[PDB]
């Protein structure tokens, strides 16, 4: 009809989704109300301005921001001086999602830079001369795979990488993040991601890892950083994704996991929160929503007959509305929520989450939902690795040609 | 000595006592990518850090240099590693180092390195006496700090400091009954002490939770806890639960209450309850109300639940095709 609002967040009934604090005010409700009031303003802006809403992904602005950042950054990034391979990954992936080609001048310089970050003993550090750490190692491998050239693949010293992973492995199945470092579920994922992509998984490398990850699932249904800790989207993504790689998703109670992640989508804002009773944040558009494709693939493998054949188990439309309307910086780049400043991390994860929300794929079955202008459509992302499905296939195929170190 | 923010702070390249060392610039290559345009102070400290690290100089001056490198970027795990090497080689007083890490954590509480460093100190000293109070102070500024709660669980578990934690949990729940981190801690304490099998304990817990639900019907955490502590034994194992939830339907409804009812029906159907059909319909009816009216953000999940319950609990479900 004519009175019909096609944007879910602008429908009159949507106002019913506002927080009900039961007249019991606590820090949690107060903070939540503040965000909802700010988000409501964004939603009502077109109406107060008397303009018809048009959801446009500011591609050219995002491209300029990324293109320059891949080369040079301000001192605002001093706090990420130990995360340079992440800056490479976040930027290259955002460009890949936006379907912007990677010039070979750029590709070769990234390769050479990541080589400088590679440790003589395996793994990659946060910058040249820094000790190897599993997080920048995961980021470096992903970045080299996004490039996907023989030169890129050849940068990875597979023998030393495997040695590095073994030096971090613990008797309980977990891994340290780096020598003398902390332990949490991120390490299991970083290790499984790089080891699977490079084909260096020996028969015992991940002995007990699936069990350790399974111990992280708590009473909430989600997964915490270490056994006993509160369920958290980033760690849950790390746990499930790692288990999917190890082909042990079944160690988890997938039912409670699914109920927990779906409950993390915010009824009013449309985006996802990282933990129950916390605020919405654009990066969780990936960590949380990315779980749905994983759960769909797992449940389906168990012959689940009730699974939809066209949608993920989350409000794809509402997530897209949240990102497009509330997470774009006018000058380029994406963010956490209105009032927050842009950064490459949020640019990478908001776009990743947007791609997940736009594309449903389950074998022969394929169904897209592109909110706003059709030019808004991004390139698909692999739900386990968060790099193009084609890069994943290409990389794995290439490394399967080499033999697992030692044989 | 000379703080990084001191008005009279001087760059290392202008310090006489460092004249013998040649700073080592960062090896970014011929044509850098993601090159950070560091400020003068940052690059200067790090060029000197690269020098001491490269020659593995385990000196008092190197020790003080790491404090500056850390203040410039507390996330530099390589600097923290070298600092720990120096703490051991130079036999530095660890309680003095504890005073230092408590100040740094107060400044940058959402950083991985600082909490890991504090853990290492506690382990080295085998002394958890300042932990609970230190953590309580951080939690007093951010009651949901993940690193703080994680460190707290480790201290409590490793040193067996369970005695007063439930009292602490109750205090924080008073301050903010919506704090999911506290509900998680409550579960943490009880699981590792009495456990939830003790019927007197489980009952106390459910009573408490229903009481909190009545006070704040829309607080999702209480609902998740209630479900979390009963779901393992099976929701149908508690016949009075259903009746009682239905009694809140009028004056205390929420999509949470409705969702829970579906959880109970679902388990009842899983454990061959009486009136298989009457229950199933009540369930599909609630799923529809949720997907179309009371909880549309989760319409895909609710439609899936309704479809699953249908798929295996309808009177036709066990009936062969030919019939």
């Amino acid at each position: 009809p004519v009175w019909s609002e096609p944007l879910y967040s602008l429908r009159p009934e949507h106002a019913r989704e506002r927080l009900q604090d039961d007249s019991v005010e606590t820090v949690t409700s107060i903070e939540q109300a503040k965000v909802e009031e700010k988000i409501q303003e964004v939603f009502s802006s077109y109406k107060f301005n008397h303009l018809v809403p048009r959801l446009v992904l500011q591609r050219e602005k995002h491209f300029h921001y990324l293109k320059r950042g891949l080369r040079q950054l301000t001192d605002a990034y001093e706090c990420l001086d130990a995360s340079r391979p992440w800056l490479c990954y976040w930027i290259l992936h955002s460009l890949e999602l936006l379907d912007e080609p990677i010039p070979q001048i750029v590709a070769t310089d990234v390769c050479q830079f990541l080589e400088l970050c590679q440790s003589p003993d395996g793994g990659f550090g946060g910058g040249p001369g820094q000790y190897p750490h599993l997080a920048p190692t995961y980021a470096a491998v992903n970045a080299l795979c996004i490039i996907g050239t023989e030169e890129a693949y050849n940068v990875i010293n597979r023998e030393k990488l495997l040695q590095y992973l073994y030096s971090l492995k613990q008797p309980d199945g977990s891994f340290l993040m780096h020598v003398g470092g902390e332990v949490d579920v991120r390490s299991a994922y970083c290790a499984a991601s790089v080891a699977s992509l490079t084909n260096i998984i020996t028969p015992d490398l991940f002995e007990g890892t699936a069990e350790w990850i399974a111990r992280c699932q708590n009473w909430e249904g989600g997964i915490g950083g270490v056994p006993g800790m509160e369920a958290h989207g980033g760690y849950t993504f790390c746990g499930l994704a790692a288990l999917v790689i190890l082909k042990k998703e079944r160690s988890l109670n997938l039912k409670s996991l699914l109920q927990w992640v779906t409950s993390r989508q915010m009824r009013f804002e449309g985006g996802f929160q990282g933990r129950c009773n916390k605020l919405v944040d654009g990066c969780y558009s990936f960590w949380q929503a990315g779980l749905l494709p994983l759960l769909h693939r797992a449940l389906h493998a168990q012959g689940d007959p009730a699974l939809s054949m066209s949608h993920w188990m989350f409000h794809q439309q509402a997530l897209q509305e949240y990102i497009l309307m509330c997470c774009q910086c006018p000058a380029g780049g994406l963010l956490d929520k209105p009032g927050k400043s842009r950064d490459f991390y949020h640019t990478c994860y908001c776009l990743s989450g947007l791609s997940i929300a736009q594309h449903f794929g389950s074998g022969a079955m394929l169904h897209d939902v592109v909110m706003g202008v059709p030019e808004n459509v991004l390139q698909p992302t692999h739900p386990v690795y968060n790099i193009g499905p084609d890069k994943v296939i290409q990389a794995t195929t290439h490394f399967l040609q080499k033999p697992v170190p030692g044989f | 000595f000379l703080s990084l923010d001191s008005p009279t702070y001087v760059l290392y390249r202008d310090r006489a006592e460092w004249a013998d060392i040649d700073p080592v610039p960062q090896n970014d290559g011929p044509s850098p990518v993601v090159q950070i345009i560091y400020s003068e102070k940052f690059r200067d400290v790090y060029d000197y850090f690269r020098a001491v690290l490269q020659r593995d100089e385990r000196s008092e001056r190197a020790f003080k240099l790491t404090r500056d490198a850390i203040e410039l970027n507390a996330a530099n795990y390589t600097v923290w590693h070298f600092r720990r090497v120096l703490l051991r080689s130079l036999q530095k007083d660890l309680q003095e180092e504890m005073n230092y890490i408590i100040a740094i954590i107060e400044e940058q509480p959402k950083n991985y390195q600082v909490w890991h460093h504090r853990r290492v100190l506690v382990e080295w000293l085998k002394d958890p006496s300042q932990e609970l109070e230190f953590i309580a102070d951080i939690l007093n500024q951010d009651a949901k700090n993940y690193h703080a709660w994680q460190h707290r669980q480790w201290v409590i578990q490793e040193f067996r400091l369970w005695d007063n934690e439930l009292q602490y949990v109750d205090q924080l729940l008073k301050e903010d009954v919506r704090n999911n981190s506290v509900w998680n801690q409550r579960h943490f304490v009880i699981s590792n002490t009495t456990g939830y099998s003790d019927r007197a304990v489980l009952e106390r817990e459910v009573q408490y939770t229903l009481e909190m639900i009545k006070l704040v019907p829309h607080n999702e955490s209480a609902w998740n806890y209630l479900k979390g502590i009963l779901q393992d034994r099976g929701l149908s194992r508690y016949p009075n639960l259903l009746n009682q939830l239905l009694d809140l339907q009028p004056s205390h409804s929420s999509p949470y209450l409705i969702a829970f009812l579906v959880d109970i029906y679902e388990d009842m159907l899983e454990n061959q309850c009486d009136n298989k059909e009457d229950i199933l319909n009540k369930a599909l009816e609630l799923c529809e109300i949720l997907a179309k009216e009371k909880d549309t953000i989760r319409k895909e999940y609710w439609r899936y639940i309704g479809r699953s319950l249908q798929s295996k609990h309808s009177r036709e479900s066990d009936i062969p095709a030919s019939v």
Partner: peptide
């Protein structure tokens, strides 16, 4: 800002 490492 959000810190992941």
């Amino acid at each position: 800002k959000c810190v992941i490492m």
